[PDB]
Point group: C3
Chain length 532, copies 3
């Protein structure tokens, strides 16, 4: 007796899964289309409503993930999946689907809080199917929705004008949120209480939706995990046309006009555009050439529809959605994963000098926009204290991590607090046992380590210790409490203080205690240095 | 002074033709477009209204026939044409046209009955231009409309969901009927009196329109000639996606998703799709491999728009148009044409044993859906009586013919009668002299033999005998009387009884007399056997 | 402080240029899109409104010219440009742009007359950017708009029916005029006073707009310079389909149906269509083959939307816009440019006999539609007076020029006068010093010589004499007076009489005086001869 739900566009057929320790099973719906496939002429256009179907659609198979680099996507899913076994996925330009995990009795009337997950991957890779919402939904009684969006060229190609504005992935996210508003009541969810949360590029997308006016009334709480829009690498500011012309030339198109480029790209096949994507070599640090010329990836643009101004100007004007907002970072954002596995840094030597540190900080211009004159001052600020190079390598990693994640997050939290909205901050400092054997094991709080506690990995995977299980339960309860109340606090949990003029935050880990003034001196130093 | 008619979309220039024995000439209009050409993006989509034209359109040339196998289409047109010479035709995806033959005085006010002809061909081949409506229109004072519709992949490709529902040819038929409703008053016809008649796949299409709700008020009488929707070979029930994926793989397309297949097939040229059609080898019995795997052709599906349920379920609920309905079969539906010429059967030996009969009945699974356990009982029922193999071959042909045409037609007539609508039945048993020299001359009432009497071949072709002329006159008068009155009976004609609890029918031939209980014992035996 | 103007679709950033002797600079806006790019499926379709843009558009770069033969386009721009240096241009199917030159103080309220320029080129070549409106706008305080339109196959391909009607360039011109009506008030112009003027194919375009009902209320004055719709070479009358099938076969497309041809051509790339254009060899006299078969170019057709009837029938019924109209010709329209540089005539010998004259007049059938029987009488009329073959070549050039330009212009002026609208005529007889060194210097009033006076070449280019400067000032003042008043006359100018039963006209040149009965005997002779 599988569950059957009746959405506006038709009826879907689900699947009951049972989690240990819970009598009620969770209804799971894999691959619900929230938008019309963006194929052919619809490429590089805003998403359109899905066409209604006539008979019950089977929703028990994982959808394809958006076309991307298969190796990088597979590696990212393996690294970030909370299920015991990694599920293979198929690439497709038809990828605008979402997965629903609802623990509600679909027979009765239920209004549960809805948490919508946005996956990371630098806006280039990633899949919604990587994350299983069975444990979180079962434990916390929330409806978990994991959405997909266009990536890479398909999602963020822009000519800088009205012919290809860009920001197609964020428009897909807005369309998915509208779908949730329209249909989540049939799955037991409460559309009047929707929380968006994401990690890395997902956190940047969450921040963008907080800034965007297109997303008004589509959510009520927000969580940013290791990502904000102030992160310079993802938000593309300046002249966007040189990158479009480079992409078009690589694809083999004429660059006479924006319309000509867009038309010629719309005629390309999926394989040709994926070959162009591989040729461009995104998400790879360029060891040779001028650092400022290299482009790490395609990303958000100030197109005039999704974002009217830059995030800095909008935050200055207080022109954003004033919802309860949670912003947090991991203790070592740049410890192992991003440098070694994701972008193949040359720091495998284990020793870093002052000269090599300055050279590598200049080579890292795309990630961190530091002018060459400011490089020596930063490198002396961080690496100057210690003489041994072993510690200096860790200090260089800390220097990169602060600029990329820590200062922007604290600045965004301060601006959100000043606008009068409730703000909460945390710093996750813990090393999951599910980590790769490649990690040196000196890394605690690597990028994405809080994902295994947010989605209840200890209950889906094997070999967790008791403290890890308790940490997962505590983090899931904090997230669900924030989703339903806009305030993470609850009974049986350590007190999480609100981020205010005291700047209190929570240090999440083996020992969970409150602290104050997160990244205060780092923020001060980098703010002074950049204004130089 | 050729006739000029002003349709809603513009004005058309016709042509006067004079038939012997009739003073008034017949106005003929060849190639009137009733819909927009289904080219490029419009492929695999419902038909759209035709764009209006500004100056008088010349309508004196036969239109192209829908793209199909040229050899098979030419052979079928030569076999079934009632004109003295066969007219060559050109393939095109732009084929949604119709031909009109009106004997009315276009100067005066005329409201003549309108007969709309749907051509056969297994939904894979055929053309409207094969049939000349000059003789019937001249003799009976009716407006004859011969329509074309999409065939093969173009007309009936389906993925089983909303991305490509299927039944494009049937929607073309509905569009042509709506065009008739809108425009047939300008040609002297009466839109309030419209009769649809067809043969083979045309009869199956007529039955489908009787069942479809999209066709409400578009016709008032119906004739089925050697074809109904209960004919299993044409209606595709089950899972439609494996056939779609086979077609896509043959065409060279990816099968990742329904939308992917549909988009990739829309990029193929006409030549590539016709090459795929020839590769698939439709309308050919597979002598090797599992019979149940082989697909004879693309056909009607239960897509939710044209047909909401299966014909059996719809007939059980009495959910169909209760118009006067004429259903008939030929005496030998499987005598020569279909097995020898159309499908190239191996039955040319002239001798058939019991073992070979059972083997061939199993090989014929696509045409007749007989489970292998039921094969021996079916073969002993027919072939068991006689010992000589010469008669056993004819009995095997009768076995195939009954299952394909006879039992389904009688069942449809019984259901229609029970629903309370007037039903009439006939069995045509005559051998036209215009038959091919290849026929053994022992076949009387071969498939499509009644066509030479329905469309007045004796008056267009050369060498007819007096009895053939009289039979053609009688059949044309019966058809016209049914069209204008819903009851074929008239003065000077043998009494044709209504199909009711007595089950009276007409035996049309050299001797025309009424009989009772057509195919009663065959229907009983095949109904009992299938429910086993 | 560049000028910024807010059009309906957005804001545009201009550029200030200063002309000697004028304190106020002229605001120049290069490349404003008035329509959506006609790319892909929009090829062979009426123009659609432009999509609005979000931020100020940069409008300081010349747009691309419509795809065409690059060599011929470059040569024509060099020959006809009034600027000191010829500006290179880039081909593109995205070419529906216009350039604005406004001398108004954009800060204040200004309502200046608007003069809209249509460029020539036989509807096959040409660009708007060739002509600089700085001098005219500065000298006369008028807003000058130079528009572009689709050319060649892209602009005038027609199948003769509703699938591809044709006249896409004329519809582009109508769209640009509507853009002017909507937006010219923001640039200081007066939409209630708009004048359209053109040359060669631009004059034929002006005449077509005068005759068309689609252009009602889009202009209030008109000027035709060496071109009218009565010119047979540009207006294609008869059966249009053979030319379409020739084009399709050259491009490699099927010719089964009009829809098939249009669809197959829409799939061709720009390069393939340009290769087809070069293969067809338009604008070249065919020295071999039947003259009547050769097609010089694609042009206007009676499609039923833009032109309901032929120009002769429309003029007979007086069914045209009765606005003040100026029609003029140059003294030697066929002297040097068109025969030698544009179409490569064989008249470089310098001697022309009677037999060779008759042969070349027969070969010239596409330009002049003279039946072979009328050739001897036409050739004896002109060439018969003089015995020396030196003068006979000039008389042959006069014969061609009269038929092509002079008789049609006087006939059109007479028809316009009879309908009751004000009419004015001129004959420009002067030799610019900016002419090519290739001219024999015996040519005075060559084709396009008045352009250097209309657009103020003496002030932009170098080396003009005093009389040339005075002539340019006089012509510019006459044109502006006609634009603002509908009557060229003013103070300090020679009296220009109105074309009436006296048939007065103005002989523009070094000596500017009024005359009467322009081309009376030529018109009489050619009218009698053709009606034979
Ligand atoms: C609108 O577009 C025009 C181009 O059509 C822009 O003018 C051009 O801008 C470029 C870059 O700003 C100029 O090149 C620059 O030259 C200076 C001096 O040599 C050099 O230092 C820079 O590194 C750069 O190479 C170019 O000269 C200028 N003019 C032309 C004719 O190209 C204009 O700035 C644009 N307006 C906007 C975007 O508001």
């Amino acid at each position: 007796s599988p569950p059957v739900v009746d959405t506006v566009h038709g009826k879907v057929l689900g699947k009951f899964v049972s989690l240990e320790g819970f009598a009620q099973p969770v209804a799971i719906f894999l691959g619900i289309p929230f938008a019309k496939p963006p194929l052919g002429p619809l490429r590089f256009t805003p998403p359109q409503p899905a066409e209604p179907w006539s008979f019950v659609k089977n929703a028990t198979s994982y959808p394809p993930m958006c076309t991307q680099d298969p190796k990088a996507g597979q590696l990212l899913s393996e690294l970030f999946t909370n299920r015991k076994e990694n599920i293979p996925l198929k690439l497709s330009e038809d990828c605008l689907y979402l997965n629903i995990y609802t623990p509600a009795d679909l027979t009765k009337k239920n209004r549960l809080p809805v948490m919508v997950w946005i996956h990371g991957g630098g806006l280039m890779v990633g899949a919604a199917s990587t994350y299983d919402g069975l444990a979180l939904a079962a434990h916390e009684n929330v409806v978990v929705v994991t959405i997909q969006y266009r990536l890479g060229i398909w999602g963020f190609f822009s000519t800088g004008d009205e012919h290809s504005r860009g920001n197609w992935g964020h428009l897909d996210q807005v369309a998915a949120l509208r779908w949730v508003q329209d249909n989540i009541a049939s799955f037991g969810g409460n559309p009047g209480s929707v929380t968006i949360f994401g990690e890395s590029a997902g956190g940047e997308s969450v921040s963008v939706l907080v800034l965007s006016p297109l997303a008004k009334n589509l959510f009520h709480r927000a969580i940013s995990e290791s990502g904000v829009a102030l992160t310079s690498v993802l938000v593309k500011k300046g002249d966007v046309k040189p990158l479009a012309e480079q992409i078009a030339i690589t694809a083999g198109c004429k660059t006479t006009t924006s319309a000509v480029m867009v038309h010629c790209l719309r005629q390309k096949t999926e394989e040709e555009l994926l070959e162009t994507t591989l040729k461009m070599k995104f998400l790879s640090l360029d060891l040779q050439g001028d650092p400022r010329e290299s482009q790490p990836l395609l990303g958000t643009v100030i197109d005039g529809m999704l974002l009217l101004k830059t995030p800095e100007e909008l935050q200055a004007e207080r022109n954003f959605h004033t919802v309860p907002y949670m912003v947090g970072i991991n203790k070592q954002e740049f410890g192992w994963l991003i440098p070694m596995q994701l972008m193949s840094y040359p720091l495998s030597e284990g020793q870093l000098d002052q000269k090599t540190a300055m050279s590598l900080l200049w080579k890292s211009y795309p990630l961190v926009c530091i002018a060459k004159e400011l490089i020596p001052e930063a490198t002396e600020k961080y690496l100057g204290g210690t003489d041994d190079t072993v510690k200096k390598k860790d200090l260089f990693l800390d220097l990169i991590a602060d600029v990329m994640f820590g200062v922007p997050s604290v600045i965004v939290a301060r601006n959100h607090r000043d606008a009068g909205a409730p703000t909460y901050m945390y710093e996750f400092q813990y090393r999951p046992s599910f980590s790769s054997d490649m990690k040196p094991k000196t890394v605690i709080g690597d990028h994405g380590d809080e994902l295994f506690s947010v989605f209840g990995a200890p209950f889906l995977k094997e070999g967790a210790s008791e403290e890890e299980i308790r940490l997962s339960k505590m983090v899931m309860k904090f997230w669900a409490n924030f989703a339903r109340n806009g305030n993470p606090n609850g009974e049986g949990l350590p007190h999480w203080p609100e981020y205010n003029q005291k700047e209190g935050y929570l240090q999440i880990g083996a020992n969970t205690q409150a602290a104050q003034k997160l990244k205060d001196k780092e923020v001060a130093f980098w703010t002074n240095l950049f204004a130089k």
